[PDB]
Amino acid sequence: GPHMEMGRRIHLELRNRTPSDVKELVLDNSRSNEGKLEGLTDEFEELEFLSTINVGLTSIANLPKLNKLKKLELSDNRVSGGLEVLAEKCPNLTHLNLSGNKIKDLSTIEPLKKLENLKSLDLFNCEVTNLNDYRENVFKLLPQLTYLDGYD
Ligand SMILES: [Cl-]
Known part of the structure; x- marks a missing residue:
């Protein structure tokens, strides 16, 4: 975004x-390192909420192990895949916001099935929300999910 590195x-x-x-930690509108996370390490052992809205993000591959992370907000970036990293790095995640990213199909969010504790997923204004029977098909893909875009 238009703020600091x-x-x-x-x-x-x-x-x-x-x-x-x-x-x-709210990093909203900061500038990622040419699309990548920087400055986040596994020293953040107590981090429960991380927000990186509008940081020009194109990959989450540099996410460190964050075993206490419960809520991750990635809205308004250009993430398009690589979501398998979450099950490895933040296995206890309960809430994930991917609104306004380059999420185009169900295959892209299929790796979220490995997040055992995932309760809430937001995909507002992503291309995938235009699929026929979008809500039905996401809940079948992610049977552990309770809420999609805020409800049922
Ligand atoms: Cl704090």
Whole structure:
């Protein structure tokens, strides 16, 4: 987004504390490193909420292990795949927001079936929401899910 580099945003949040202290981190509108996460490490052992809205993200492959992460907001980026990383890196995730990304088909979100605790998924304004029987087919793909785009 039109703000600071992501690494600089993170360093400012870490003035006078350490990564293991942080519970929530809002990196919205910072600038990713040519499409990639930067500054996030596995030292963030207590992080439960991470927001990286509008950071120009094109890949989540550099997501570190975040075993306590419950909510991940990735809205308004250009993520188009690679979602298998979440089951490896944040296996306890319960809420995922992918609204406004390049999610075009069911195959792209099929890896979310490996997130045992996933309860809520948002895909607002993604191409996949234009598929016939979109809601029905997503719930069949992701039987553990309770809410899609906020309901049923
Ligand atoms: Cl915090």
